[PDB]
Amino acid sequence: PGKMDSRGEHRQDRRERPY
Amino acid sequence: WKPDEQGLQQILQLLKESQSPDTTIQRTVQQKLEQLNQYPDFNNYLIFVLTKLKSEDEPTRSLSGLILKNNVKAHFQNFPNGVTDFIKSECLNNIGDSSPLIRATVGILITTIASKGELQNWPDLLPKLCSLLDSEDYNTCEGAFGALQKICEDSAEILDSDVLDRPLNIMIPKFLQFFKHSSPKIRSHAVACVNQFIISRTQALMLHIDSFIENLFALAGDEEPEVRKNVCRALVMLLEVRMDRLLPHMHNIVEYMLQRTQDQDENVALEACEFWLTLAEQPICKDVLVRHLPKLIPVLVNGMKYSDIDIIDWNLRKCSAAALDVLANVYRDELLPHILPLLKELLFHHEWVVKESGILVLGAIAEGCMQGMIPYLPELIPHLIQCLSDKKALVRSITCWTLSRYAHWVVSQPPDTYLKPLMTELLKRILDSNKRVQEAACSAFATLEEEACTELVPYLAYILDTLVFAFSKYQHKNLLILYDAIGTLADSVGHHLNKPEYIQMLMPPLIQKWNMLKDEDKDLFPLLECLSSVATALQSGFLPYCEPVYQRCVNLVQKTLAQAMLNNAQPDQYEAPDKDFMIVALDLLSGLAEGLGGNIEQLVARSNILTLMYQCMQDKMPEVRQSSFALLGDLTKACFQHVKPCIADFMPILGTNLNPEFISVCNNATWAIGEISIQMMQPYIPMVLHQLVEIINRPNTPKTLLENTAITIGRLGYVCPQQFIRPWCTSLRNIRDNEEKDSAFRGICTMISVNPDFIFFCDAVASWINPKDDLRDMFCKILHGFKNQRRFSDQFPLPLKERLAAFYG
Structure with a gap:
């Protein structure tokens, strides 16, 4: 209950990935 | 028409001087051309030297052609038609010059013209080029195909636009005539051209698809790499949009693609490998793979090794x-x-490249195969932990990632057996001397932080010690990941971070990097x-820090709005702004307002934030609205006195953003209207209620x-x-007991008293884990009221039936 923010998603997008 | 000797000698002289090895002569030739390019007759001379002066050598003719090309892409609007048309004529007339450098230069010229000044300002480019395919001289047809290929590449909207009156209903059946062609280059061009119009499902091709597919198969046998590559990528694209057409041949196709995936030419193999990626999205994958999967898995696993050249983006x-x-x-x-025997041979191999591929495989399959892998994790995880201190950096980094892929399982086990040593060694790896390890470790730790949450509190000091220490160590690429790790730590451990020691060690280097970054540096986002x-x-605690942060953020929103207005006013002179600066600034102001609450009033009193917000809420970009409604809710809670004057304006917009197509805009608007409600508002209810009821009965985002x-x-x-109580109750019974739930239940009690309904859910929902006393009395008063007003209550599950005697039976 509360607002939705995109911080976490943006961090996952910036996160290191092997493919 | 009118080249004169003095002019020609002067321009040729300039080209020769531009070819001087001397650096100073070059720079002054630069300013001389800088001036000359704005005079169209000069361009007439340049094209003349390219196409007409057979006498002059190739690098001079070509340099003239390329300078001209640059002029045609920074000054083409101000070209008169007489010169343009002279260039166009000379280009199409010289497209097949026997010098490859000249031919290539003419090609860049044609394609750059078509580019800069759209394909209709040249109504007859395509028709002449097409007819030029039929010509005799090889170079002529090669050149024309090359030009068309480039045009199709970047001018692809030739069918969906229909600006040049169906510019593909002629070309495509004409390309397909050239699949049969004797020369490999031309075949390649033909396929590369057609390929541009597959995923668009382009009519001209779709009604010729059988001829296409047949000619592709006829081409399967071709050994020229570019043709194989293009056939492979044809089939891959076709697979995405016209599956039906290739079902009857799927077995032979899978066999072919599986062969090509093993092709010695890296590019062929890569295009082939895309087949498995796109096939795996189709529901018929299992059925189509039944005969070939056993070979497919080892080929993929083997292709997952680093290349020889890679031991030093998208690849095999x-x-x-x-x-x-x-x-x-x-x-x-x-x-x-299929995969466990390969893992057994890979994970322990003595050749690091092979082991590395094994760890990669282990991570890759984690999501799909997680359940099946659980039995093996008590052995593999400690082993991976050991690999974290392998002496090969690429092993350390891939180990970091795979462990992060198993973070959930690690966290669900007793902390001392896996979690503790893993976190310890990840922290060690964050300070690795290798930069790829550093970022892999920080990313993986972030993922672990996210999964663990409160489980990190005991290790908070050591974590902060390391994250802070990374500031002096990390370069630019890695500070971004470091900020993400700090952010996720703060989100994971919440208020536990509020300790004087932690604040003092963490904040100064954050402000330090804050002061280095300029309002235009994208590195602000993380x-x-x-x-x-x-x-x-x-x-x-943040109090000592809010002031500059608040001001700078508001200012960034202001200047973003300004640039956006200016660009809307004069698009041809002022760059549109990057609205992420605005989204991020709003998001930080939201966090500040949530943290400080009421204590932000003083800052808001001195601010136009609400007047900026008014324009943010109406922005075309969903994320801007979503952020502005979030800030609206936070400021509504924190300092309503500054918001109240604006409510009458803000509300109709909230009412117009209750569109479930944009989940997070609708959500933040809804929340805002709940918070504003509590502070208030009868006239605004009708413009919003109906939509909210629609949203609560909608079978999505349960x-x-x-x-x-x-x-x-x-x-x-x-x-x-004046129902909706079914989903309301269903939705709200599952949320934690907090203030919001309280408010909503007070509302449902008041509402039930006015229109009493015959669908007890409320009672099931009423099972509050320790409600405040006045709320309890409201509950048992309504319940008792009904009881005074069974076979139905026989159906209560035991926990419900029993609970509703302890508080209100």
């Missing part, structure tokens, strides 16, 4: 690994008997998002959107409403 390794990832998600545990979480987390809608509907409870 990455494609193969992605394909394995999706297949793992399709086959789930059915894949494990830092501000980090600060937002820290601010929300540090609640009490989670956070519905709960907020319910709470808001609950809050709108202090009115004469």
Whole structure:
């Protein structure tokens, strides 16, 4: 209950990935 | 028409001087051309030297052609038609010059013209080029095909636009005439051209698809790499949009693609490998793979090794690994008997490249095969932990990632057996001397932080010690990841971060990097998002820091709005702004307002934030609105006195953003209307209620959107409403006991008193884990009231029936 923010998603997008 | 000797000698002289090895002569030739290019006759001379002066050598003719090309892409609007048409004529007339350098230069000229000044300002480019395919001289047809290929590449909207009157209903059947062609280059061009119009499902091709597919098969046997590559990528694209057409040949196709995936030419193999990626998205994957999967898995696994040259983005390794990832998600545990023998031979191998591929495989299959892998994790995880201190950096980094892929399992086990040593060694690896290890470790630790949450509190000091220490160590690429790790830490541990020692060690280097970055540096995005979480987390304490942060953020919103207006006014002279600066600035202000609450009033009193917000809420970009409604809710809670004057304006916009197509805009609007409700508003209810009821009966997002809608509907409870109680109750019974739930239940009690309904859910929902006493009395008064007003209550599950005697039976 509360607002939705995109911080976490943006961090996952910036996160290191092997493919 | 009118080249004169003095002019020609002068321009040729300039080209020769531009070819001087002397650096100073070059720079002054630069200013001389700088001036000359704005005079169209000069361009007439340049094209003349390119196409007409057979006498002059090739680098001079070509340099003239290329300078001309640059002029035609920074000054083409101001070209008169007489010169343009002279260039156009001379280009199409010289497209097949026997010098390859001249031919290539003419080609760049044609394609750059078509580019800069759209394909209709040249109405007859395509028709002449097409007819030029039929010509005799090889170079002529090669040149024309090359030009068309480039045009199709970047001017692809030739069919969907229909500006030049169906510019593909002629070309495509003409390309397909040249698949048969004797020369490999031309075949390649033909396919590369057609390929541009597959995924668009372009009419001209779609009604010739049988001829296409047949000619592709006729081409399968071709040994010229570019043709194989193009056929492969044809089939891959075709697979995505015209599956039906290739079903009858799928077995032979899978056989072919599986062969090509093993092709010695890396590019062929890569295009082939895309087949598995796109096949895995189609529901018929299992059926089509039944005969070939046993070979497919080892080929992918083997292609996942680093290349020889890679031991020093998209490549065979990455494609193969992605394909394995999706297949793992399709086959789930059915894949494990194929993959475990390979893992057994890979994970312990003495050649680091092979081991590395094994760890990659182990990570890739994690999502699909997680359940099936659980039995093996008590052995593999400690082993991976050991690999974290392998002496090969690429092993350390891939180990970091795979462990992060198993973070959930690690966290669900007793902390001392896996979690503790893993976190310890990840922290060690964050300070690795290798930069790839550093970022891999920080990313993986972030993922672990996210999964563990409160489980990190005991290790908070050591974590901060390391994250802080990384500041002096990390370069630019890695500070971004470091900020993400701090942000997620603050979100994970919440208020536990609010300790004087932690604040003092963490904040100074954050402000330090804050002061280095200019309002135009994109590197603000992670830092501000980090600060937002820290601010929300540090609640009490940030006070000494808010002032510059608040002002700078508001200012960034202001200048973004300004640039956007200016660009809307004069698009041809002022760059549109990057609205992420605005989204991030709003998001930090939201965090600040949530953290400080009421204590932000003084700052808001001195601010136009609400007047900026008014324009943000109406922005075309969803994320801007979503952020502005979030800030609206936070400021409504924190300092309503500054908001109240604006409500009458703000409300009709909230009412117009209750569109479930944009989940997070609708959500933040809904929440806002709930918070504003509590502070208020009869006239605004009709413009919003109907939509909220629609949202609460909608079979989508059975989670956070519905709960907020319910709470808001609950809050709108202090009115004469007139069901919707089924999903409201369903949604709200599952949320934690907090203030919001309280408000919404007060609303449902007031509302039930006015229109009493015959669908007890409320009672099931009423099972509050320790409600405040006045709320309890409201509950048992309504319940008791009904009892005074069974066979139905026989159906209560035991926990319900029993609970509703302890408080209200």
